[PDB]
């Protein structure tokens, strides 16, 4: 489909909304991302039964997480959620609405992880935090009132990468705790090898994820560009056998579309149960716009339901 | 994606009498229904009085309660084949996951009952669900319509028919790879995924359904035949599921977009790696299982609205 | 490809009176024609007698000799705009590279002369080239037809018209991003590349051309209006050029394939990174220069045949 | 478009035509390729005014080339042509028909190069030969009766790779002799980074270039897999500035489609004049089937004409 009518206007408004340029400093981009994000969060105005912030001891130091509990009960399913933002931007705050809605619709406790950001903390800082936090959720199921046997990982964009890699790390360690993975338009190839979608939808006219911003993200994340060949950076090059069932959500007008769909297919070739759906008429990051985009609401509903019944399994 | 590996395997394994093709489709469908092995809390067959006589329906009740949400479901089969039986697993599972009463409508089949036979029954069945909320133990303000392939067409047209009479009982429409253009105006996808190598929906079978369904070629120009040419304003919110390797993909995706252009909230999602009719294969296809989960949940929260 | 960089730059730079839009198109076209700065060995304007009166044509002779190959060329402009002047550079260059005499036909424009006006002239002009080989110094066994956009439509329909009368003077047809379906039956590409951001062929301009061209909506069902619905058997070999970012892409590619299905040799090639009408931009677009080179050469060796 | 009606039959016939498997020895695959190729060559039955075989001294030893002269005259345009075959298969013989027709239609002398094959001669053996032969043509213009100022490179598939890399090598050396490049469905990314087309069209049902055969080619060509990162292996990662005007021909149902179209686009981004055309309804290698495929005839006509007027320039 063409770009949704309402989304043209949304991008039109972000046209003269202080645009990104490669020489901008990280603090300014972070601030703008947070402020813009919080408009959408406040718009959503999601309820939640119970919410609190906790500290998880990571290899790199204390890791903050937000626990969203949508109902009472001592053995609820859990989702460890990783926010997007290019490995450089975002926080539990920027994605607070998505996490509340996810909890409410799935009935699962959502644990949103405030993983360390680049360039202050280069790859593999965030990957370590992401595994450490998910493992801690498994180990501390009792304190949390969750079922240690019903933990899923999930994340959007750079967070989809962290979810995918956490599942790989658990697999590599011979661990059972990741039962399900939902990858929301993940980045799975962090090298400069192109796909058609990466070039097709990354021009300045798409705004949300441009070629300039992608390269800038890549420069912040990596100590040296060859680090991108690591399967913990580019999980599309990993051994994909024995990974947990996967739902991969993609967007039609998204640079990362091709690689997301390729990841789903490659999972299948190694015997993993895996589904790839493409949301038509929308851009990368569309889920965060759900208060004003019907595709965003449909996506949260699908993701929530897929986790609740582990439908792909 | 390419074609999912198990689906290639299945396909590689796989002027006729209308009665003979029905038996074959029936036989094949029931293999999948038995594989599903789905439970249901309560199930019963009823007789909806319709304009062409008694319309058989099957009521799937997943739980107790008055004022449950409702889904009027229309089975696929190209307007000529299929029954409440061929789609029983999908309806049990839909009922169970959505928490809603599903009324599966055994609409009149062509070529015996040609267009607009099935369309009248589709509308009569749905409005009868609307007029009997109390007896059904369903809420008259939470009625959805849903259907697959030729069923998706009836679902969409039932919504159009209700709109046309100023009726507002249709609150939500899930169109599972629907047929919205029944004329021969080709789309890229219609030509691309209709070769013999696809089997389930070939150019020959499509042309054959069309000859069974219509009394004359020109009847496909009707908005009740080809909803994609109808006025789409003031229609209920829509979820349109499409398959990647499906002749009807393009028209399905176009229908969602045309709905948007007339101010209706609507979402088109494409399941990669799969063919038309993949929902019925859910017991051996993860895409099938995800679709039923999405459809159930989208109806439960009316997410697109 | 994405949109080629220079073309984005060009686009970013860029109830009306029919006369006013013509002047604007004319003015814009002539900028490109002067940029081209093309030579021609011999050029002259002639008056072909046609069924609606005198049809102006322009004869471009690239070299000496009797029995040169011939190309009857039809300019674009949505049936309403354009002239032999707006496409002069393309015809000089075509003539020069193919070695063939190009007869550019100044067909009658709508809304003054509505369908089937231009179609009769298109056929009359071509058959007149056929009947006057001697006077033109061209071979009556080496006649091709060619045209861009609305011109591609006339080229294809002229071939259909000749076929319909048992006439065999049309030996080859090059359809440069043709309009083969003039009904509103949407294709994915028609919706995808017709937004205001594309400018050259928007949904509004297409709907406007259609209202100028036809006396009534139903006339677009004619095979002389929408050739993609005509019988395509026994038609001359075809080269179909399409643009990647073009509303008419899908129907263009479908026309080549439908030709194949009726046993006609036909090739569809898609130029990436470019929009409808890109051939006329050849002086600043390498894709334009390649297209003219391909078209000239394909006609010279009748390569698809 | 769908797969051409006649091409289904062609692939149907190649279904039970002794199919490839990864453990086959190189000699057997070479023999089958040659025999199959020569059916098409004999079918074409192309004339040529003058033809002879010569020896070109390369860094690695004598290099055989075939000179196709379509007309008389002492300063004709030239095309140095590189046959396809995965870097492992093929010869001047397998592509003899295409070269004669090219010469005849373009009016250029075609020099078809019998470059060294893998695994006997690993990368960069063939790349060295390909540059050496093109340079020799420039240096020996007088002996050949060609214009040293009007030399083009051209090649199909693995040969498109060699043509692209020869142009890069000349550029890197600050040389002017390559004036034009025609890349016929080239392979420009020899790493295992996927594109959608690479996965979509490489199943056994397409026969001509399957995932199995692509990996086998890759194993023969490279001494070690990391050699594939070299820009002389994967020219899509090279600096593409100041390269000669480019025509890139692609096929709709070809694993290499995406990367070919990406190469054309990337050339443009560095200011190179570059056109990508996609032939619908056909597979990789379709040009060699021109006696029975109208798309093959159209392609040779286009390629010939583009070289004759250097139309993209």
């Amino acid at each position: 489909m063409p770009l949704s009518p309402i989304l043209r206007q949304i991008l039109q408004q972000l046209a003269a909304q202080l645009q990104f340029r490669p020489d901008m400093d990280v603090k300014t981009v972070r601030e703008q991302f947070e402020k813009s994000s919080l408009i959408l969060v406040k718009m959503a105005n999601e309820p939640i039964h119970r919410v609190e912030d906790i500290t998880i001891p990571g290899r790199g130091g204390p890791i903050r997480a937000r626990v969203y509990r949508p109902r009472d009960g001592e053995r609820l399913p859990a989702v460890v959620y990783y926010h997007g933002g290019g490995f450089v931007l975002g926080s539990v705050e920027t994605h607070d609405h998505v996490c509340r809605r996810l909890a409410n619709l799935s009935g699962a406790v959502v644990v949103s992880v405030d993983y360390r950001l680049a360039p202050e903390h280069k790859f593999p800082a965030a990957v370590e935090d992401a595994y450490d936090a998910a493992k801690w959720v498994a180990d501390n199921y009792d304190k949390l009132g969750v079922d240690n046997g019903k933990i899923a990982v999930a994340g959007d964009s750079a967070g989809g990468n962290l979810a995918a890699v956490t599942a790989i790390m658990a697999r590599d360690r011979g661990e059972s705790f990741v039962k399900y993975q939902v990858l929301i338009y993940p980045a799975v190839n962090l090298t400069g090898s192109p796909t058609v979608s990466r070039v097709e939808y990354s021009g300045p006219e798409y705004v949300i994820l441009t070629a300039d911003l992608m390269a800038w993200f890549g420069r912040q994340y990596f100590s040296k560009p060859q680090d991108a060949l690591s399967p913990y950076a580019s999980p599309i090059f990993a051994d994909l056998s024995n990974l947990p069932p996967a739902l991969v959500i993609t967007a039609e007008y998204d640079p990362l579309r091709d690689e997301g769909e390729l990841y789903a297919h490659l999972l299948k070739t190694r015997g993993v149960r895996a589904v790839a759906v493409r949301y038509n008429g929308v851009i990368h990051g569309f889920v965060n716009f759900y208060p004003i985009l019907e595709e965003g609401r449909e996506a949260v509903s699908q993701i929530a339901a897929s986790i609740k019944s582990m439908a792909v399994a």
Side-chain angles (χ1 to χ4, degrees), chain A residues 84-190:
Chain A
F87 305 101
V88 182
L89 312 167
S91 61
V92 300
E93 320 291 350
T94 58
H95 288 60
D96 193 84
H97 63 321
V98 177
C99 280
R100 286 171 176 244
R101 199 174 180 92
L102 179 55
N104 292 337
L105 291 172
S106 70
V109 168
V110 174
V111 188
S112 182
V113 177
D114 219 34
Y115 57 85
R116 280 173 297 168
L117 299 175
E120 298 91 338
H121 303 292
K122 293 290 195 176
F123 169 81
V127 168
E128 287 174 356
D129 293 344
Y131 170 82
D132 288 348
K135 179 59 170 293
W136 183 96
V137 171
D139 294 346
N140 293 269
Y141 72 103
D142 195 59
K143 295 169 205 67
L144 296 177
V146 296
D147 190 332
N148 57 8
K150 302 181 310 236
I151 295 167
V153 297
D156 65 301
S157 188
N161 176 280
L162 295 181
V165 170
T166 295
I168 288 164
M169 278 170 84
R171 193 281 311 281
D172 289 347
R173 295 167 179 258
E175 288 168 344
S176 295
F177 74 88
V178 184
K179 298 295 191 302
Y180 206 76
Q181 59 179 315
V182 183
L183 313 181
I184 307 157
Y185 33 73
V188 300
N189 191 339
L190 303 186

Side-chain angles (χ1 to χ4, degrees), chain A residues 1-280:
Chain A
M1 312 184 331
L3 204 54
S4 191
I6 198 160
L7 197 55
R8 283 164 174 268
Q9 303 182 5
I10 287 162
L11 286 176
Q12 275 185 257
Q13 185 157 19
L14 287 158
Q17 188 67 44
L18 278 297
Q19 184 188 241
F20 166 84
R21 56 170 214 292
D23 73 306
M24 278 188 174
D25 69 331
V26 176
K27 178 176 180 276
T28 309
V29 181
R30 287 205 177 126
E31 279 170 20
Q32 181 59 70
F33 185 81
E34 200 82 13
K35 282 189 191 314
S36 291
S37 293
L38 279 319
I39 291 172
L40 290 172
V41 170
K42 297 281 295 212
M43 234 166 58
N45 196 33
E46 298 295 352
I48 194 68
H49 170 52
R50 288 294 188 271
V51 72
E52 67 184 318
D53 283 8
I54 67 174
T55 307
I56 290 174
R59 273 169 281 185
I63 302 160
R64 183 158 145 275
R66 180 157 297 172
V67 184
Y68 303 89
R69 167 172 276 278
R71 57 191 177 101
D72 296 311
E74 67 186 23
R75 283 183 78 156
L76 302 186
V79 184
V80 187
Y81 190 88
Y82 308 105
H83 72 81
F87 305 101
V88 182
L89 312 167
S91 61
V92 300
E93 320 291 350
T94 58
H95 288 60
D96 193 84
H97 63 321
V98 177
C99 280
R100 286 171 176 244
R101 199 174 180 92
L102 179 55
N104 292 337
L105 291 172
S106 70
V109 168
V110 174
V111 188
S112 182
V113 177
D114 219 34
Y115 57 85
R116 280 173 297 168
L117 299 175
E120 298 91 338
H121 303 292
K122 293 290 195 176
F123 169 81
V127 168
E128 287 174 356
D129 293 344
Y131 170 82
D132 288 348
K135 179 59 170 293
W136 183 96
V137 171
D139 294 346
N140 293 269
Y141 72 103
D142 195 59
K143 295 169 205 67
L144 296 177
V146 296
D147 190 332
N148 57 8
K150 302 181 310 236
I151 295 167
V153 297
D156 65 301
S157 188
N161 176 280
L162 295 181
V165 170
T166 295
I168 288 164
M169 278 170 84
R171 193 281 311 281
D172 289 347
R173 295 167 179 258
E175 288 168 344
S176 295
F177 74 88
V178 184
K179 298 295 191 302
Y180 206 76
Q181 59 179 315
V182 183
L183 313 181
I184 307 157
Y185 33 73
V188 300
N189 191 339
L190 303 186
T191 68
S193 211
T195 62
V196 175
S197 71
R198 274 235 183 175
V199 164
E200 195 69 12
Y201 308 119
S202 61
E205 75 279 12
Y206 286 100
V207 199
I208 219 146
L209 187 64
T210 61
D212 280 357
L213 198 67
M214 288 191 264
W216 183 81
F217 287 143
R219 287 191 302 276
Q220 308 312 316
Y221 195 43
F222 293 120
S223 294
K224 64 199 188 294
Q226 320 92 255
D227 292 359
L229 297 167
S230 169
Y232 294 155
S234 300
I236 198 155
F237 304 128
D239 175 2
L240 302 184
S241 50
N242 311 111
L243 288 170
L247 172 61
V248 181
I249 302 301
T250 59
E252 179 177 10
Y253 298 105
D254 179 351
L256 306 185
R257 191 188 69 191
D258 288 0
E259 67 196 72
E261 301 183 353
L262 288 158
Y263 195 68
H265 164 85
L266 290 165
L267 283 167
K268 296 177 171 291
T269 70
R270 306 305 316 277
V272 177
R273 295 153 281 164
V275 171
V277 185
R278 173 192 297 190
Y279 277 66
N280 292 325

